[PDB]
Amino acid sequence: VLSEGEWQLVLHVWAKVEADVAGHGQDILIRLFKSHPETLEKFDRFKHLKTEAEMKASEDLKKHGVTVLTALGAILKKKGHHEAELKPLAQSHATKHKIPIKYLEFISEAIIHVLHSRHPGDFGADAQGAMNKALELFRKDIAAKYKELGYQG
Template structure:
């Protein structure tokens, strides 16, 4: 629970406005999960967008806002996240085919080692609880 509490202390600015902080060009890089390469590799709808145009792209920003919203829900559940995780796991295994290693996010260096480690451990718990095998995806 301490790890969830530590991460939630940093989560406030993101949670206050997911739309503002969801895009690559938001200027608030608490999380390093929205990098150009992974966005374009994992989501084909972004593949045809020039690298310089992805930052500030409305569709990419909307996707980032959705990711932040779901991550916030998972964090606030503090481990009691089965009801949130099941539909997320289902769509990411059967529709998007997103491998589990792509769920690992980390706080940027401005949050310090303790914050980074807390988020790593929290995401580790969430990833373990994603049951792709039940869905027929090795992920």
């Protein structure tokens, strides 16, 4: 359970992201794919991209980064009361896209890295700890839905 103070830190940086959702989304997906190439393999849409320049040039990858960050922002702004938003996302990522929980750990690390690079004055250690807690709560709650469906592994 995050405290109200921890939520405020999370959402303060997140309001900065919403100024350039697409730039952040590209940076986070590129970092994920470069740091963890097995993740790129889950996207039939992107598996043709072989270089970071090709990734940066893909308008389709930038569109998907916006999709991802708009869904995460709606979850964060629920401050934990996110069951309605998480259900469909867990269901599709477990049963259709076949994404292990560990790859949600990986994208969480990429989000934290990109927020530190782009917003260092609003992402000191207090805010990095709070965002880590928020992303752990997201993963916890997705993992419980995976387990229900038989995909916690």
